[PDB]
Ligand binder design. Sequence first.
Ligand code: HEM
Length: 180
Amino acid sequence: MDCSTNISPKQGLDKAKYFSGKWYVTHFLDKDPQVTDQYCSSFTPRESDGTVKEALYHYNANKKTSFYNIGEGKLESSGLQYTAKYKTVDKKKAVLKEADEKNSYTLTVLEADDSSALVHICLREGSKDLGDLYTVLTHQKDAEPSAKVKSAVTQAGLQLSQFVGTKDLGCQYDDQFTSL
Ligand code: HEM
């Protein structure tokens, strides 16, 4: 597998709209999943002098288990795009593994407004691309994405209908973990 190539951040986006609130994934598009388990995710991204830190949460909807990470990276010269190394933590944010130099993700923001966003994420380990994911995001669980963000899905060459909708998965979030 190869992460999608035509990916660059939309220019003219207002970063205070992305580094805002918390995000819940309402729809995801996973190109070549190595597992069949489907997940829910929420994260809280903050930025300061070009360094991003974000608490990251995954819920396995089949096994009904959750795992936790903290990402850190630097904004690119191109705009709202950053490559993040990440720690592995427990629900109390105790560090189980420090960030290393082989594991990272690149996050690119394709659209972001007052209520919603579209972002792309390539997860990598050493020389291999592990996962390519598009995610539609809202600020509350199960809120409808904006017409603008829906338009950006189609602009990106995609069909929203072909994403997995997370509402039917029976998601469970930990809003204490994502807070702050
Ligand atoms: C609902 C949306 C998402 C889905 C379906 C999803 C799915 C997955 C899956 C299946 C894995 C591998 C789990 C394993 O077998 O260990 C994973 C790992 C990971 N994801 Fe996501 N993910 C989502 C959202 C996100 C987002 C928004 C971010 C970044 C902000 C992110 C960052 C990561 C990272 C860093 C890992 C590596 C964790 C590790 O190696 O322990 N994910 N995700």
